[PDB]
Amino acid sequence: TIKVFTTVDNINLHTQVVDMSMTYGQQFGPTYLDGADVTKIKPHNSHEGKTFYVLPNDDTLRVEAFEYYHTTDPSFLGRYMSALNHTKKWKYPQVNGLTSIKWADNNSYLATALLTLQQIELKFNPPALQDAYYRARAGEAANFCALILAYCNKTVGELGDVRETMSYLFQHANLDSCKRVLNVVCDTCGQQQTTLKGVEAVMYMGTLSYEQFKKGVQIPCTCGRQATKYLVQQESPFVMMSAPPAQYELKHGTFTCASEYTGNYQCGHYKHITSKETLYCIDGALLTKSSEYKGPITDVFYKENSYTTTIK
Amino acid sequence: TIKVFTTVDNINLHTQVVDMSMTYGQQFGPTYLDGADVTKIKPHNSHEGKTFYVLPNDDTLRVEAFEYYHTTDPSFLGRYMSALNHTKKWKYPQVNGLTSIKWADNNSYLATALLTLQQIELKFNPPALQDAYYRARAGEAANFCALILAYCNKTVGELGDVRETMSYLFQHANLDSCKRVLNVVCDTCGQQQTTLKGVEAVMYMGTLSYEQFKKGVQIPCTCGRQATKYLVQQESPFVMMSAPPAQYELKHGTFTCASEYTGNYQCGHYKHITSKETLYCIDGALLTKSSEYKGPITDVFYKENSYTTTIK
Ligand SMILES: [Cl-]
Ligand SMILES: [Cl-]
Ligand SMILES: [Cl-]
Ligand SMILES: [Cl-]
Ligand code: NA
Ligand code: NA
Ligand SMILES: [Zn+2]
Ligand SMILES: [Zn+2]
């Protein structure tokens, strides 16, 4: 027999003594060592003193998992470890000053998400994400990518959606101060104001142009007639403007970054465009520079702080 | 010669090749390995591939240090490493469900500070503090204690002040939402309202009683005459009420925790009192329980969320 440590966060360690003739599963249940599933593996002499991840099956581990990951779903740790086995094998090159991801397992949506996070002001709340994102920016993004997949209930290889992924991440971020007030003008119903906070204050679906959002966009009223919705006030470090993919021109110096999607829900591919001294198309490990850019844009990010309209 | 890594955060590693005949100082300047000062030590065969801390002497390291520690003082890392050499030797026992510190090097002010942090809602901003505090709550508080000393410009062994220490820590915490409005009534000058935000909104010096703060305390007006200051509105997860040490009775169930100071500035000692099912005096590694408590109290912490006065 040998002494090991079990954990859910690699910080709070629990001592265990295991029988070398039984599998780690019969004793601990699902068990992982350095991201490898050892549930059906019998203890080995070379395992002594090492640290093993396990599913939170007692209340002490559940609280530790909740404190570290900010979720109560007990299967989260297993989803995280399963994804991590693959993401450790991905490559995370520095492209145009940012940590990207070499293409693998249909991971283009994760790369453009990661590239985007490095260009907007966003702080994560869960300790696990705080630690994984700091390492991700340093070029070791395996844990961060595996966490994203676990939080989004996606498995490695699944085609992903950036806007939906950013939505999950934003929920685990500090957007407390963010505020948005909108006005819908229906010349039959009048003016109807709304106020949004948190993630609803930074995400909008329907138009890519922040400026058109301020001038006014045509959207059906609650009565069904065509009305006009325009931005009254915004208080945020950034705004995410999304719309179904359609040909769209990205003007240099008028946005921060954007996501391009080519394909459909069974097969497609994301590319990332960022406005630096010139437009740069970051395509995983590939990089292309252009004076102008046009393509099927689906998300556009803009920097903000405080905006108040002038419309009466 | 050998290959090593230099760092300021143990995450961003920089490869180096060192001559085994020169000291790490002549090549890197101040150098630390696992918290030990190796500046005057010549490289050894057993050092190959290991990670060394160095002072940020180029702009790449300076930015990394700033991102990790949220300070631009270049000597911070040296102060942190010097303190860490000692705090690694301290003991961090679990007392009354909290991570305390066995007494050493006049560290009572650090223990009551640490005990207090585990009982109030507070999130740190610097990655270094986020990581060290999470480990501190797990019983490995050496790095967290060493960071406190570095941030407060205190060395191991120096007598410390809890209120001043909490002030430094609060600056590196998210108190954005915190707000306090006060009213001073001088029957000669009238009503004069003030609004405080951030750390000024949670800390007050002059009285230990939050309730007396709401009823009104006698404090000189700006004109010099005696006036009355009372709490108009508070928006915070907690408030810290401090006053010069004086005999004071701590009533069970009417506060969260408090600091007791016995002595003076050349020699003294802190004790921590917390209100659980009964009053508990946590004295480093020592623990005492009592139905009632009285002593030279100097800080008292209370839980809050939203308070609006009723005074006209
Ligand atoms: Cl790392
Ligand atoms: Cl922008
Ligand atoms: Cl640790
Ligand atoms: Cl209280
Ligand atoms: Na960012
Ligand atoms: Na706390
Ligand atoms: Zn209408
Ligand atoms: Zn006066």
From Swiss-Prot, chains A, B:
Gene encoding the protein: rep
Coiled-coil stretches: none
Domain Ubiquitin-like: 1-54
ZnF bounds (C4-type): 186-223
Notes on how activity is controlled: Inhibited in vitro by GRL-0617.
Chain's role: Responsible for the cleavages located at the N-terminus of the replicase polyprotein. Participates together with nsp4 in the assembly of virally-induced cytoplasmic double-membrane vesicles necessary for viral replication. Antagonizes innate immune induction of type I interferon by blocking the phosphorylation, dimerization and subsequent nuclear translocation of host IRF3. Also prevents host NF-kappa-B signaling. In addition, PL-PRO possesses a deubiquitinating/deISGylating activity and processes both 'Lys-48'- and 'Lys-63'-linked polyubiquitin chains from cellular substrates.
Compartments, as annotated in UniProt: Host endoplasmic reticulum membrane
Identification of the protein by name: Papain-like protease nsp3
Active site annotation, chain numbering: 108, 269, 283
Result of altering residue 89 to N: In strain: Beta/B.1.351
Topology in the lipid bilayer: Multi-pass membrane protein
Species the sequence originates in: Severe acute respiratory syndrome coronavirus 2
Catalytic activity: Thiol-dependent hydrolysis of ester, thioester, amide, peptide and isopeptide bonds formed by the C-terminal Gly of ubiquitin (a 76-residue protein attached to proteins as an intracellular targeting signal)
LRR repeat spans: 114-136
Binding site for Zn(2+) 6: 186, 189, 221, 223
Peptidase C16 domain mapped to chain residues: 68-312
Self-association state and partner proteins as the record states: May form homohexamers. Interacts with N protein.
